[PDB]
């Protein structure tokens, strides 16, 4: 079980970006935080709650804290985890309405994004990566606004 | 002369919009029933705000309140954008007041400047804001507010007197 104390920059940081360039084989685990997974390139086997997914560029996964998942049989798998703590979000967006897997396992954890969706996600995530400093005034609020933009754009662009 | 949000905003639901002045023609003294941020991208002119004259050029930033009376008295290929907004229509629970001089009343200091970095980041966000605030696709209104919030925080971060 991965702990937010080990993955977030402080107790008040609500969102962070964990780059996996590449994602190597990773053991079955749960979390005490949630995460969005976006696959940028390569492929691999994502096993989510005992269900195997052959994942590839354009795949989007919504993961809840209590989901157990792993990565195996990877091939230059390039992804990003956008990790977040629901209880730390302050903005009044309807997070639960826009994020499958916000309060429990997603009904549908797996989605896809087209070129436009990936372009917008790339742009927002790049800015979000830059807002990680816990010393720059209100960087955490700026990061939450960008996470909000990412969440809306994913809802706008995603498909089954 | 008083400019009305009914004329400058697309709908009653729009909280923020972007009005391009490429360039800004001479414009008579006026008030509004909405607020605006003014960012100057290039050229130069004269901006008279509550009867105080400002020679303006690239890098100038003004926080304008609805009740402010202002004009552009002279202009020389003056290129700017107005980010117009209605405080009463903003739905996001941001501390808008803390980041925007001129939010509830005329600003104590309406005039700031931005350097190269701030201008580049402001231009990127405004370009996105212009798109979102002018379309009717899913979550456009939400995106416009989120982008306006990002802009306002970036300005707060980079502006100086
Ligand atoms: C944050 C953590 O990072 C790991 O490398 C792996 O990708 C996990 O799925 C994720 O929960
Ligand atoms: C919205 C309006 O647009 C005008 O061209 C002028 O720039 C005014 O200052 C502004 O209030
Ligand atoms: Ni995980
Ligand atoms: Ni005006």
UniProtKB/Swiss-Prot annotation, chain B:
The keyword Repeat applies. Activates expression of the rhaSR operon in response to L-rhamnose. The keyword Secreted does not apply. It comes from the Bacteria. GO terms for cellular component: cytoplasm. Keywords: Activator, Cytoplasm, DNA-binding, Repeat, Rhamnose metabolism, Transcription, Transcription regulation. Binds DNA as a dimer. This is HTH-type transcriptional activator RhaR. GO terms for molecular function: DNA-binding transcription factor activity; sequence-specific DNA binding. It is found in: Cytoplasm. GO terms for biological process: positive regulation of DNA-templated transcription; rhamnose metabolic process. Its main location: cytoplasm. The gene is rhaR.
